[PDB]
Design a protein around this nucleic acid. Structure first.
Ligand SMILES: O=C(O)CCC(=O)C(=O)O
Ligand SMILES: [Mn+2]
Length: 201
DNA sequence: CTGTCTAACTGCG
DNA sequence: TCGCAGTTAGACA
């Protein structure tokens, strides 16, 4: 309850803190201890004709048989684990929404980042929201309008994502706006992000 | 065969 | 420290 509502032209989102420091610290430790990340061949993507190692670590968990694909990289979900189930069920019991898949991004520090994109693929249940839960260091998250890089120019939306926070990205946000987690060199500590989604069978 | 798009980078300013 | 400009060991419709 008591969400901060992020609203603009074709942008509907909401931000809330889910946990206090003591709890979120406990979940963060467990994530650090328990999550396994893809390496080598499953850590490379194809963008602008070139193959790049990703500047971060990624993991996927979810219901058996599923798959997710972005930028010429196809990831297969590992079976659920308690710490992840715990978070999922908490987000479910607060939003009403259900989820069968989570992508985990770990930025060891402000050098690690994700370039701007739309969480795009049609393998994603249409109309469904995306649940972004963040642990560890606060990191600036940035929204930017599609046609703004620039015919008619809507203002960029900056937002800090805190320890134990939840960002909800409701439809139609992801058709209209791009998002990135830009480099911040002042940031020395790790951060783990869990974006929960609903995937089609 | 044309045009729209790119979850990433270097090399700047 | 930040982020813009210009992408392209090109994909795809
Ligand atoms: O790091 C985040 O806050 C979200 C990362 C992201 O954009 C994604 O999981 O696709
Ligand atoms: Mn994303």
């Amino acid at each position: 309850h008591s969400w901060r509502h992020i609203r603009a032209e074709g942008l509907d989102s909401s931000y809330t803190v889910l946990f206090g420091k003591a709890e979120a610290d406990e979940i963060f430790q467990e994530l650090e201890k328990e999550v396994e990340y893809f390496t080598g061949a499953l850590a490379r993507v194809q963008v602008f004709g070139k193959w790049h190692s990703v500047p971060r670590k990624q993991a996927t968990y979810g219901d058996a048989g599923l798959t997710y694909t972005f930028s010429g990289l196809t990831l297969s979900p590992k079976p659920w684990i308690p710490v992840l189930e715990r978070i999922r069920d908490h987000v479910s019991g607060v939003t009403g929404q259900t989820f069968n898949f989570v992508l985990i991004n770990r930025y060891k520090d402000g050098s690690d980042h994700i370039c701007e994109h739309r969480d795009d693929e049609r393998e994603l249940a249409p109309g469904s929201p995306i649940a972004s839960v963040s642990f560890g260091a606060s990191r600036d998250f940035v929204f930017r309008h599609k046609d703004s890089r620039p015919s008619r120019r809507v203002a960029v939306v900056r937002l800090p994502l805190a320890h134990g926070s939840l960002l909800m990205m409701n439809h139609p946000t992801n058709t209209h706006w791009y998002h990135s987690l830009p480099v911040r060199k002042k940031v020395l500590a790790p951060r783990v992000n869990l974006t929960f989604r609903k995937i089609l069978l």
